[PDB]
Design a protein around this ligand. Structure first.
Ligand code: SF4
Ligand code: SF4
Ligand code: SF4
Ligand code: SF4
Ligand code: SF4
Ligand code: SF4
Ligand code: SF4
Ligand code: SF4
Ligand code: SF4
Ligand code: SF4
Ligand SMILES: [Cl-]
Ligand SMILES: [Cl-]
Ligand SMILES: [Cl-]
Ligand SMILES: [Mg+2]
Ligand SMILES: [Mg+2]
Ligand SMILES: [Mg+2]
Ligand SMILES: [Mg+2]
Lengths: 623, 167, 167, 623
């Protein structure tokens, strides 16, 4: 076919079996790729028994996916989809791994990973060769050591075998760190040290399968495209637009650490107790002069080059390496912990990167624990040491406890939501009032109180990905900001930061590749809508340990109703009754009933009528 | 007047727009391993662009058993007759920089042809603002040939320069 | 649309062609300490270009006792009326980045006027291939003001980043 | 005055007095600046007693000079001139210090330094303030420590004084290392770690005066110029031409270490025993990838940016810092010692830079000693260790001995010529056959045997600067290579590497600055010719310890008549009879008599008829 290979690899780690399965055009026209295609596979294979599927158990599926634009549109993303250990729903996550490009050049569109290997393995893909290999020598390695041993060795192996064909480029690799290996529920899947499939806890899924890494190398061409000449014209157009984003290319998200708090008053400060600050130490000017050793770094085919590399040659944390760091790490491993100085932030970012932990849900649990310590709820003896705001050494000790599941770390390793429940039961104190999450997923570092940021009122409250700030809901529900459009980029699969040409142009580009004729109206009223509805259904089925009830859980954490204590919009916070009104409107606009459950009529019109069986089981639990 | 591509690896961002441009120009499709300039990133952030240096003694041309390779008289680039190529690997082995590359299912080696005298890789690298690639216009200088080196050698040299004993 | 000069110190070569161009443009003579962009090299090879960032609250303008300083409505640049300046130094002290400079025998402060909208320092830096200076077009962003800081602080930060504990 | 201030500082270190002295338009029209102006001052003050002037004694003058183009023409050079401890003549040396620029912006064109301070001092110039200051705390420091202490402290002092005028740029500094402090006869004067006034031994002159450093800061404008609009037009024209030298800007002289030996067979290898090699380790590609941390570095107003900075973060020589290194260091501290590895070369270049030793005359004496060790003439017991080709640790040990004047180091600290005489007397063996010098100055790293390089037959043999490859003679003696034109650049003062516009255009630029109307013919027949004639006279008057006789010393070292042993022109070398013919022809064209002594009639025509008194003393010594 055009733009896809039409094949997935199916890998059974229990039985140590590999096979190719077909990817039909009808499935592709109905779900597109990436997030949408993965949501369909999960519902079809598991939806009938979803509430019994343990995401850390061997019956979960780990899906590594692409879409038709992957490899042709500027920039580079691979999609990762599974049942989430955080929300018990589905998260369409992405990371800037060339794995997706290498898969397509080797003849595949993606990987279905099932079961669980007896011992640590890695998955090796080299054109037609697919092998499950022993990984016990690499279990316990962080990213730096893994690139220097496993990845280099596999490259050497391939170089020697292909000697008479020349020297192949490096293979692409995704992997977990010790956080994923020990099934910390907010562990991430990593690539290239500093890139993450961040939301959803998929590092724990991958570690629960004893899978250390996936390594892929392809040397064939990408699939044929339907309209080559149109594709080239559009590419030239897109490059030229993307080159002109001067400050984003120079700074990436690195100006966020100062800007979001100071300018928008929407940055978490000490577990969201404030959202404004005035502290210039965290300005990008100091990250650049004190830490950046590479100012322009890019993924495959990317004219934006938003990435940077920070590296410490001095001080107690010399050897630490990270990116700008990304704004979310500057906030959640920085200002959220009362830490503003670049050296300390690069240190803590390095640690979560090396350990394979999502910086957002990690920083959230660290700030939660520090507020509990502030309030006397967690004592020095509970922790083993004092946890003061601003003390990066104490936060690093806490990270160690979490990864080793030692002491209080065994409770905190479950994530903010589950840990708040447990500490509430243990202490006889409601600490869920300090837990800043929606649907079990920590809220990203963009608050709603000031209404000077892009997030407001229902952004997190009704999203099928909870606190995921990279996939928020909007009013109107269709319409080019909001869940439906993000579902497209997470399915396409392309990088958000490369979408300046706009939703309609990018859809046009995709038709030029695939031969389809999808319209923006068709994406918003059918294809994206069915993706969102299936994710809504799987999230509401939930289980086995945590279930959601939309009448209380389609809402903001209670801290988001407390007036802002400081800054230029001191006193501001939304009103819960307005939020309740907007939620009911969102239901109407998106096709849910008055209780937030997808309407059976809408499912049947979306071509997913079978899901009434799941909608039927959601309602008995709820009544 | 002849041209030569002078490479500065520490200014390479890894955008690989040179690979997209080159493979689209010569294969009409995006095909990273058929690009005649290929960027090696064996450790994240250490990016090494790699291509032909037009050795004056052309080891590749002189090793080919079927005479599929010749030298363009205007440029001094290697020219591949893809029909005569039997993908034997002799040119791959003869090249001091291991530049010739046989991608999966092409049925021929690929080698930089200098885009007939106007390299499109240099143009896109310059347009993007990286300038890791630049054209030099005089007569060939013997030191140019010393740049034909194994990309793994250059990669490790740079990693040790940047990260020191901690690498 | 307004402009702002974004500086990348690690791409600065120290050629100081920006100083030659600026002082020739505004003084008609070569005069390093009267250039409105000045490059600091406190340790060999660590080059830090330094100029006005057009603080939106213009501390310099508001500190002046003789109203010698104003703001150009088109560009947002500071404008010096040299005849009203009494070289008192209040603007020097008010500036977070210590940017205003009173060179020997001028009898007035000098401050970047953005060359009326087309910076000649940026042009020569780009023409020379360094691109340590680049124009950003669009509305002012508050983070721009945080770049006004003392060049000795920037110099020391960079030296420690490059040379580590050996500095 | 246009283009000059018309003033020199006069500094008496013995009496601790400073004054200003007038520089007249008549003197400036006659000698121009830098090398020519310093040659005139030296002859005027010392010519009558020249052969009694010890270059390391109180009576020598150390002159720091500029010319009219200094500060206006692209690039930046300061001139240094004195009686040379190597040749006992004069060397017009230069280094890319902004000292010259800062002097002119403070109101001076240069400095006459006389006498000797009782204990170590430094000279401090800030606009109208000129002070001789105690330097006892800095005596013994290398350049890195000196920038971090003295220069930083002087900048902070200036900053606090000038607080209400803004922050001044950094002052400029020239300085000596321990080699100058200990009066090693080939010690250099340094600036910015790796720039040098290389030839002539002026580091020992400076150290002999107890002068550690000269630091200058000016904040006024340069002198007025005669035709400012023409100056700006020419400046734009010069920039555009100079920007186009693509490979010289990217590599500087760093491709020399490979190219001069391999392509031109004219690079010293093991004390000139060979001049050809095939070794690719020394290619610039390896210096860049293994050592360059700054690829584009430049002096004031320079569109060429030929400089680079090499730095070692690894291996036993971690911490070593140098430049590309300059080709002459790649040769004389590398291939001349049998060393080809970038890491080793950066190490040894760093050592001579930190010690303040000219890398050319240092490499020459080290390779001399290593050849004497090869031939059994210097034993292990004489040295204290073995001195094998390629052993950078042994050469570093020998450097230590030389700087401390300990053991054999006391002999070698006197330079290759004087050392060879001493060792010949001690051993009863003629080792002068292994000493590659002319008139006491090591031959720069460009041989004459292959005739593939720019140096040929009489290039060094008749030059008034001996082995100095940056000021070689040509046939025709006028004409645009050769001594007369180099005398202009060393007097203008401008950098050789920015002279692409050519002699005539640069003369014309100097007229636009100064309001003079000098023509190329006037330079070649009068102004440059009188500078060369005075240098010849001072050189022929000579020592107190060493005298030259042109009937034997206008000649190449005997090794340069040995056939080349290897390479594409194996077997080639010039014929001493042809050299003798060309020397006699050079005398004719330049205005020397049949014995190589300037003709008394030519001196009168040149307006320096008073120098007949010196020509007369040269003749009784020689007769
Ligand atoms: S924009 Fe940044 S993240 Fe997205 S592909 Fe380009 S470099 Fe990677
Ligand atoms: S375009 Fe330039 S910067 Fe981008 S990869 Fe190619 S060589 Fe490197
Ligand atoms: S570099 Fe390799 S491919 Fe290019 S000319 Fe030399 S031998 Fe042929
Ligand atoms: S591979 Fe093709 S080009 Fe290379 S030598 Fe063999 S036949 Fe000739
Ligand atoms: S010059 Fe043309 S052929 Fe050679 S690599 Fe660049 S783009 Fe490809
Ligand atoms: S021109 Fe650019 S590179 Fe040269 S000094 Fe000015 S800022 Fe630095
Ligand atoms: S930077 Fe200094 S000089 Fe420029 S606006 Fe701000 S206060 Fe005024
Ligand atoms: S120095 Fe001049 S400009 Fe600055 S405040 Fe005083 S008078 Fe006004
Ligand atoms: S913009 Fe104009 S005034 Fe401001 S520094 Fe650059 S050249 Fe000088
Ligand atoms: S050419 Fe090189 S040495 Fe001469 S002034 Fe410019 S940078 Fe300095
Ligand atoms: Cl490392
Ligand atoms: Cl250092
Ligand atoms: Cl000053
Ligand atoms: Mg990151
Ligand atoms: Mg996302
Ligand atoms: Mg040097
Ligand atoms: Mg010289």
């Amino acid at each position: 076919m055009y733009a896809y290979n039409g094949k997935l690899l199916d890998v059974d780690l229990t039985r140590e079996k590999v096979k190719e399965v077909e990817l039909s055009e009808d499935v592709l026209k109905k779900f597109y790729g990436g997030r949408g295609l993965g949501t369909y596979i999960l519902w079809k294979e598991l939806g009938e028994k979803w509430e019994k599927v343990d995401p850390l158990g061997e019956e979960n599926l780990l899906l590594i996916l692409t879409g038709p634009l992957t490899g042709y549109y500027p920039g580079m993303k691979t999609s990762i989809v599974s049942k989430s250990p955080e929300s018990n729903g589905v998260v369409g996550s992405v990371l800037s791994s060339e794995l997706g490009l290498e898969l397509k050049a080797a003849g595949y569109d993606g990987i279905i990973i099932r079961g669980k290997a007896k011992s640590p393995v890695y998955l090796f893909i080299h054109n037609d060769t697919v092998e499950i290999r022993d990984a016990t020598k690499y279990w316990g390695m962080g990213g730096i050591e893994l690139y220097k041993t496993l990845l280099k060795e596999v490259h050497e192996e391939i170089r020697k075998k292909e000697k008479l064909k020349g020297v192949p480029k490096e293979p692409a690799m995704i992997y977990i760190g010790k956080g994923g290996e020990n099934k910390v529920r907010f562990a991430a899947i990593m690539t290239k040290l500093m890139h993450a499939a961040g939301y959803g806890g998929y590092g724990a899924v991958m570690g629960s399968k004893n899978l250390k890494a996936v390594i892929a190398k392809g040397s064939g061409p990408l699939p044929e495209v339907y309209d080559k000449e149109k594709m080239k014209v559009l590419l030239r157009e897109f490059w030229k637009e993307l080159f002109s984003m001067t400050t984003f290319r120079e700074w990436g998200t690195g100006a966020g650490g100062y800007s979001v708090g100071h300018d928008r008053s929407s940055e978490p400060i000490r577990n969201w107790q404030e959202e404004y600050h005035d502290n210039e130490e965290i300005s990008v000017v100091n990250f650049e002069n004190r830490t950046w050793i590479k100012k322009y770094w890019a993924d495959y085919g990317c004219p934006v080059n938003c990435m940077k590399i920070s590296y410490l040659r001095y001080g107690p944390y010399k050897g630490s390496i990270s990116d700008a760091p990304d704004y979310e790490l500057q906030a959640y491993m920085g200002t959220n912990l009362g830490i503003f100085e670049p050296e300390k932030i690069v240190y803590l970012s390095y640690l979560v990167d090396e350990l394979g932990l999502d910086g957002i849900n990690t920083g959230n649990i660290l700030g939660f624990a520090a507020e509990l310590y502030q309030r006397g709820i967690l004592t020095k003896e509970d922790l083993g040491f004092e946890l003061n705001w601003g003390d990066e050494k104490a936060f690093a000790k806490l990270l160690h406890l979490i990864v080793e599941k030692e002491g209080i770390g065994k409770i905190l390793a479950e994530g903010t939501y589950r840990a708040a429940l447990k500490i509430s039961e243990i202490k006889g104190i409601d600490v869920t009032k300090y837990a800043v999450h929606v649907k079990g997923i920590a809220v990203g570092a963009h608050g709603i109180r000031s209404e000077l940021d892009y997030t407001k009122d229902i952004s997190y409250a009704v999203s099928v990905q909870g606190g995921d700030h990279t996939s928020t809901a909007a009013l109107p529900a269709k319409g080019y900001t909001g869940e439906l459009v993000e579902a497209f980029y997470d399915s396409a699969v392309i990088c958000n930061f490369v979408t300046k040409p706009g939703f309609e142009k990018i859809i046009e580009f995709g038709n030029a590749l695939s031969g389809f004729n999808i319209t923006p109206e068709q994406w918003l009223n059918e294809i994206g809508l069915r993706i969102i509805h299936l994710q809504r259904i799987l999230l509401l089925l939930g289980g086995p340990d945590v279930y959601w009830d939309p009448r209380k859980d389609d809402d903001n954490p209670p801290r988001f109703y407390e007036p802002l204590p400081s800054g230029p919009v001191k006193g501001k916070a939304p009103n819960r009754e307005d939020i309740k009104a907007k939620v009911k409107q969102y239901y109407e606009e998106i096709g849910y009933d008055e209780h937030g459950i997808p309407k059976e009529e809408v499912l049947e019109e979306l071509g997913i009528g079978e899901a009434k069986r799941e909608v039927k089981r959601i309602k008995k639990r709820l009544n | 007047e002849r041209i030569w591509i002078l490479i500065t690896p520490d200014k390479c961002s890894g955008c690989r727009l040179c690979e997209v441009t080159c493979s689209l120009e010569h294969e009409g499709i995006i095909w990273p391993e058929a690009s005649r300039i290929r960027v090696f990133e064996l450790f994240p952030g250490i990016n090494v662009p790699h291509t032909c240096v037009q050795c004056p003694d052309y080891p590749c041309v002189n090793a080919c058993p079927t005479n599929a390779l010749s030298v363009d008289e205007k440029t001094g680039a290697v020219v591949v007759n893809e029909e005569k190529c039997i993908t034997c690997g002799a040119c791959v082995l003869a090249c001091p920089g291991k530049v010739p590359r046989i991608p999966a299912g092409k049925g021929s080696v690929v080698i930089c042809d200098l885009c007939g005298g106007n390299p499109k890789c240099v143009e896109i690298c310059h347009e993007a603002g990286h300038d890791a690639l630049k054209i030099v216009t005089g007569n060939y200088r013997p030191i140019y040939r010393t740049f034909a080196k194994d990309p793994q050698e250059k990669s490790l040299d740079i990693a040790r320069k940047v990260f020191g004993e901690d690498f």
